From Swiss-Prot:
Residues where tetradecanoate binds: W82, R106
Effect of G86V: No reduction in stability, impaired ligand binding
Induction (free text): By peptide YY.
UniProt keyword Acetylation, yes or no: yes
Superkingdom, natural source: Eukaryota
Molecular function per GO: fatty acid binding; long-chain fatty acid binding; long-chain fatty acid transmembrane transporter activity
Modified residues (N-acetylalanine): A1
Annotated protein name in UniProt: Fatty acid-binding protein, intestinal
Family: Belongs to the calycin superfamily. Fatty-acid binding protein (FABP) family.
Example GO BP: fatty acid metabolic process
Lineage: Eukaryota, Metazoa, Chordata, Craniata, Vertebrata
Organism: Rattus norvegicus
Amino acid sequence: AFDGTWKVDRNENYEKFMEKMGINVVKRKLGAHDNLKLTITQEGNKFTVKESSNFRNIDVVFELGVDFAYSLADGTELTGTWTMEGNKLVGKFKRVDNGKELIAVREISGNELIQTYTYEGVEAKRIFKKE
């Protein structure tokens, strides 16, 4: 049950991961303070994620297993899929610039939604709290 609003609580190795991605210092710095919140709606295999931050306010729509295009809030463009792996949502992306692969994972640990990002042997964790 991914359903509902998840507000960021704590971050793990996040600026290091942003540094890895080639992201600008002030943009990393503000990205560390982003006040991110996800309001997730499942409508079958069609997922809508209202993504809300200090940078932006976006509705992300995606259907499980079908490639979509996503832009980071920094403008990094990515293309890829989210599949469900039992209890997880596993995103497999690739930048449109370099074509380097980005791996995302979404788990609900009780009342925690844990988001893990992996790029170039660098892993970052962002922990959200159920509102």
